[PDB]
Subunit: 229 residues, 2 copies
């Protein structure tokens, strides 16, 4: 159909991540489900190459924007991109550390959104908290969504990770979501997506197994009018 | 510890800004009021050097974090800083344009806060919308507040400005607020301060000026407990 019509039911998803950090190759496969009206969903991820050679925390954003809950007043761009699908190009630059560059494509097969991601994690510090797995949690944040020409939206974020030492590791997140079709698509005005994440290490024998939950919902913050009260 | 106790009063403020943009000096003086419970106040800002050489819009954040409204449950660092006061060092880097670097000092004189700001605006594009006065509005945004060691807090923000042709100019805002005293000050956990800003002209002031209203309030996004439920 077109857009949200296709998300009025319970859905699933599958993710394949092709990655490398500092030259070390890794593979992640994940799946989960999201039940209408969405905005609170879980993912079960497995490192198919064994032990993840970095913290799982910075993986959080790689392992579903179309499953955020949107208000009626804001066009849900990520949902509207279907059936043609969407691409995502993203950088997260960590202060005093490496930068993750990812390229994502999303496709809908029935009620399953399949994602294929390539990711390059370059110039990470071997003795920093990312490579030494010293990130403890993932801070809640208020991502910013901006129109980005006639066929895309830009998502800007500050993704902080608290460290064992009690400090913060800050990533500067810059993501472009692009519509893959030729038909005219509505581009939402500026808005926000609150994102709350919790990751859990699961029973794992030879492969890392991590569960992650995310609550994600949009809001806006509208203008003021009178400028003397 | 005390401090937020002082702000239970109605208060006034005065701002002196010593600036330059592309080797052109300017001077701005501003004043206004804010009444408890704060969070919604006006400033009258005047260019004392004739005509301001750049858009007034990117001056919006130079022309009072202690007048944000905080709820019970989030420590108001900017208020916790008094009576000793605080300083700010801030960078706003505009995409494809210049960088504003500012040093602020805030001192309490009974119920007046006096701020002194020096700002260097360098590498701004003479044919860009900042130098050409082609910014039309300031986008409301969700600024992110983080602890920064034991005597400071960091405010990160994406401040967008609409241009006259319908585009967007994005500034990347990074501001460190530092306590100017020796005692142990309570440092808040990560949170947000929503900032909504609007500039207008007073018809009866013939000087180059703006009147600016700002609504600012803190809020927190509660973390989730289970990565499943």
């Amino acid at each position: 159909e077109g857009g949200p019509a296709l998300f009025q039911s319970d859905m699933t998803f599958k993710i394949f991540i092709d990655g490398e950090v500092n030259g070390q190759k890794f593979t992640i496969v994940a799946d989960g489900s999201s039940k209408f009206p969405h905005g609170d969903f879980n993912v079960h991820a497995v490192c198919e190459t064994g032990k993840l050679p970095m913290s799982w925390k910075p993986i959080c954003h790689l392992i579903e924007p179309f499953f955020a809950r949107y208000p009626d007043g804001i066009s849900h761009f990520a949902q509207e991109c279907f059936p043609e699908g969407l691409s995502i190009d993203r950088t997260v630059r960590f202060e005093n550390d490496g930068t993750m560059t990812s390229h994502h494509t999303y496709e809908l097969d029935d009620t399953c959104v399949v994602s294929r991601i390539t990711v390059n994690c370059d110039g990470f510090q071997p003795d920093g908290p990312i490579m030494r797995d010293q990130l403890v949690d993932i801070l809640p944040n208020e991502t910013h969504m901006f129109p980005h020409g006639p066929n895309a939206v830009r998502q800007l974020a500050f993704i902080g990770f608290t460290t064992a030492d009690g400090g913060l590791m800050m990533g500067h997140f810059d993501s472009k979501m692009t519509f893959n079709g030729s038909r005219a698509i509505e581009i939402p005005g500026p808005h926000f997506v609150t994102i709350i994440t919790k990751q859990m290490r699961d029973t794992s024998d030879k492969r890392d197994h991590v569960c992650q939950r995310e609550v994600a919902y949009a809001h806006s913050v509208p203008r003021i009018t009178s400028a003397i009260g």
